[PDB]
Specification:
Three copies of one chain form a homotrimer. The first copy, chain A, is an alpha+beta fold and 418 residues long. In chain A, 34% of the residues lie in helices and 24% in strands. The complex binds a molecule of 2 linked components (NAG-NAG), 2-acetamido-2-deoxy-beta-D-glucopyranose (4 copies), barium ion and chloride ion (CL) (3 copies). The site of a molecule of 2 linked components (NAG-NAG) has 2 residues of chain A, from loops. Chain A: Its main location: membrane.
Chain lengths: 418, 417, 414
């Protein structure tokens, strides 16, 4: 009778060992991870890269007759027949100027390049930048690097490219960061006389705070800043460490692109777009990097734009961009105050030779800074390693039947002898 | 002497095994969890449901003499004695309209319904919606579905109700989302001539971005949008998975509500309120769902409001809403640009046959989109499961005394003799 | 041949046990932790303390001739030679007043000057409501910061009970209508260090256990808008060494009852200024002597700036293990509505323009009646290590602690 109770106890114990062991094994092959959040104080923080664009792509006073000829349809200033659209709400002077530039009688077309057009007709930072301050000391427009995006000629402060060393901040708070007073030059905006898809009613700038290791993607990752306010941006540096397969989904390999030195998801997207447009239309857009020839406005109309839209719509499988394992993100909180005060309106108007109306509707102040001298870390950590797996299997294997790998080897010994 | 040192080693080993084993047991019985954060790229994102209200509950030009008679005191247009309050700083015409509407001389009242009054007097989406675009293609006011909230007649885009399929976005950024130009119609706002508790000075709209599975709760979960700016709202889809008892506190059961098909904490809140008001006052407010009769303004005055206030403090234990285990939340970052530009102000003024002053104080553009085509996941994960407990107990049990469950069974066997 | 493969299996098995066991040993000695996020529903939430300053340090109408004499250079209204700045863009009345106050023919405490000349909450506070019930200016406690005379609602200091809210949403919180008094702003005729073009207020939402640090931790609120602030209470629990970096011993400073990272920062600053200049600035607390405007120019400011740059290691403030933080999301609506501008203008005896350029409404509340908890939790405890080493020790060679002791015996005998 005792051998029966022993047989039942050994059988049930071996069954429990079976299901528990297969449980821990399956849990290991899920490759599970859990997250470790930490806050690290630092004596210094590397200030990020700040890219800003004017919402107006190009200045009206800088557009020329040749520009209307080649890119008149693309710039939406002229209709398909090289004639001005509906004149509703058209200033007499502006409409006469445009009508004069669109005469096109005995006109010899000069050579035209999209990057030349954006570079000269775009808003000059030397005119927009009314004042610059970093850590309380003056900055020059030479700190701003020209970057071409979908919005046109844009500028990146502290880009850290072309061998310039990146700036640091040793104190947090509103004073100890970037602080620029900009004039968005609303007088230079393209007149809107007729409704169009490209017609926009916004006035202000668009800013993206990003690491120097990634290029700007201002059309998607930027936030707007409106004239007439001083906007504060409190930043919190975040350092992210992800896990590669089979734990998570990250880009383990450096994967350097021909266009960009360091791999980033932004660089992967704009690289994918660049390759697609170069293959499909044999030309490259203004914002894209490389050595390819830039598109002509005819190529823009008949190939480039429908090609990108078709790439977005047809299938995401062509452009699948994984996230790198080491990522520096910047968190940001926005707040506003009014500019200028009644005590300063006259002084600003006289300082920049403008009317107080103009100052009120054209001046914005951007204040970008770190809230405090610390950074957060978010790390994906492996939850079950092979040492822990063997430890649990050994513990339960020793608890239920008290056997070992040598014991199973001995049972296989008798099986081979049998 | 050797058996004595052996006895000391076995005793100390058995004590240590005792305290370590009870340690792992107690840690298991705390039922602990830890969190798994992950970010997932996606080729498509389901666009959320967007509900907005005008801050002005009902239009002044649509209020009628009968409305003043029944709900004049409730709307704060008339005083306790059904008379207009002080006319201080009242436009002559503006007051003339109200004085004529509140005559009540030889007036034979007609039936009155609160939901009819809000549905007819509230701001019409056909007049507010100056332009609508979703993913660059035009939308109609018919895309917005009417929901009645505490703020009055409100509208939900991509509500996904009545069999409509939920919309998706295949690109991120400002262009590729919902983008509406609204006229908040500040001329239709209730005149404020005298101080009252209900008096408010704000002008604009209130928006809540929420999953289609939940009803809006704009009085608590909404954010404001001011006229004269294009407000960008960058959304981040977050997918949350919680643990039921005994690990955490989540809804293990489906939790069928009578009013709503899907369970949500909001649906639980307005369910608690609706049930409480039906039991105490036998009527429901406009925002509440169901089939009960709507309250009359007298019922609102003498029963509903004090009942809700008594519900907040006295019965704070009475309404307990557990959180569901699988929840889709949307995070948001707001930024603004100025509207309109000087190059467009007059074109807007002529396009909508308004003065530039009006455009300046009445037009707002709302741009709701996903920052990028990805979603975050926040999961509560069990930290100590029974397999790990048995493995650790077996490991320490085998390290300290080298025993097994069969060893203790044999010890009970020898003890049996 | 069988004993040879048995011996090799025991050798290799002991090697595997060695590397796995040392693996768990080293992993345990990393002292790792992982994060636990949780959301806790509550019937009540303790409302935070809200400190706000006007961006304008002191009122122009309250400055007197003596104040111009002593602190004229510091306040930037007068130059080093006690003369008026450039007369470009100067109000005729303001310039006549300043020249008259600067007559300096036949003609001071910093805290008296800030306390009396600063913006009075009794004039700024046009309306106050908390949970729908009226509040008085006496509920705000005066705190002196770098911005000047500032005010803290629900400060909870001096034994006052902390306020609670039993409902979430815009109505059920603090709601104040303020007049920033833009007419009292210092006239700016020439460039100066204090010169600012902003108009509005600065707010910091913080727990009562920590002092305000509004020049660094504040956000702006612009006039002409009602800004809503949705708050989410967060409770953070950190680990002390060797797991993390937290202050296990509170080691509260004499200046403040409860230890906070901010309180440690301003304590270090006060101590440094007392050591180098034998005086304390306006914002600093204690019983120490306040600086004179001459002391400010030649000692205080360069000492503070040099303290930030020269020795950043000197002030090391550890983070406490239990920290209550408040998350916040801002949004705006326009104030006043066209239907309400006239009533406000007449109610407060101002022009409709003045209301447009001076009135702001602040609405601070909890989004919902819950709070988040973020806890650092130990990933490998000594019981788990002994369990893993025991499991692998029993799987690979099947030995025990008693087995190793017996091996020491048999080795000792032979
Ligand atoms: C990602 O960041 C980690 C640190 O956060 C890097 O790990 C360091 O790698 C260097 C080798 O170049 C070592 O000298 C350091 O000791 C490592 N630090 C730690 C904490 O392990 C890692 O190399 C980075 N990965 C990439 C691809 O850049
Ligand atoms: C200010 O600008 C106007 C615009 O052309 C110009 O005529 C005037 O001379 C300028 N004044 C000064 C002082 O430069
Ligand atoms: C435009 O509005 C005015 C009143 O403001 C009205 O008289 C006129 O008929 C309107 N025109 C159109 C085309 O609606
Ligand atoms: C810290 O806060 C937690 C709740 O978040 C509480 O349980 C604990 O008692 C507090 N004190 C310590 C020393 O952890
Ligand atoms: C109202 O404002 C005027 C203009 O400054 C002032 O003279 C008058 O005294 C004010 N009324 C009161 C009651 O303060
Ligand atoms: Ba009752
Ligand atoms: Cl997992
Ligand atoms: Cl727990
Ligand atoms: Cl670790």
């Amino acid at each position: 009778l005792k051998r029966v109770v022993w047989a039942l106890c050994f059988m049930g114990s071996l069954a429990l060992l079976a299901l528990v062991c297969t449980n821990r094994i399956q849990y290991y092959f899920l490759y599970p991870h859990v997250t470790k959040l930490d806050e690290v104080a630092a004596t210094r923080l590397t200030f990020p890269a700040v890219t800003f664009c004017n919402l107006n792509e190009f200045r009206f006073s800088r557009v020329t007759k040749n520009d209307l000829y080649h890119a008149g349809e693309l710039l939406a200033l002229l209709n398909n027949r090289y004639e001005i659209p509906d004149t509703q709400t058209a200033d007499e002077k502006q409409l006469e100027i445009l009508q004069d530039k669109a005469n096109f009688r005995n006109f010899k077309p000069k050579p035209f390049n999209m990057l030349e057009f954006y570079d000269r007709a775009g808003h000059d930072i030397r005119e927009m930048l009314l004042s610059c301050f970093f850590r309380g000391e003056q900055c020059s427009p030479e700190d701003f690097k020209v970057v071409f995006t979908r919005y046109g000629k844009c500028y990146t402060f502290n880009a850290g490219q072309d061998g310039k060393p990146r700036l640091i901040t040793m104190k947090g708070g509103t004073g100890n960061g970037l602080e620029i007073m900009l004039d968005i030059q609303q007088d230079e905006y393209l007149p809107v006389w007729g409704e169009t898809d490209e017609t926009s009613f916004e006035a202000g700038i668009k800013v993206q705070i990003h690491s120097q290791d990634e290029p700007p993607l201002i059309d998607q990752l930027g936030f707007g800043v409106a004239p007439g306010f001083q906007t504060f941006v409190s930043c919190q540096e975040q350092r992210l460490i992800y896990l590669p397969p089979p734990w998570g989904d990250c880009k383990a390999t450096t994967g350097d692109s021909e266009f960009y030195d360091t791999y980033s998801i932004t660089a992967c997207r704009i690289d994918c777009e660049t390759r697609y447009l170069v293959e499909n239309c044999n030309c490259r857009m203004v914002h894209m990097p490389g050595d390819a020839p830039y598109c002509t406005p005819e190529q823009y109309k008949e190939c480039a734009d429908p090609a990108l839209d078709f790439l977005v719509e047809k299938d995401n499988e062509y452009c699948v961009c994984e996230m790198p394992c080491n990522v520096t993100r910047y968190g940001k909180e926005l707040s506003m105050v009014k500019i200028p005060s009644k005590a300063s309106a006259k002084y600003l108007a006289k300082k920049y030779n403008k009317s107080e109306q103009y100052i009120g509707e054209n001046i914005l102040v951007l204040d970008i800074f770190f809230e405090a001298l610390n950074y957060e870390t978010i790390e994906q950590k492996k939850a079950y390693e092979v040492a822990g797996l063997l430890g649990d299997i050994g513990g339960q294997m020793g608890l239920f039947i008290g056997a070992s790998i040598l014991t199973v080897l001995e049972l296989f010994d008798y099986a081979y002898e049998v």
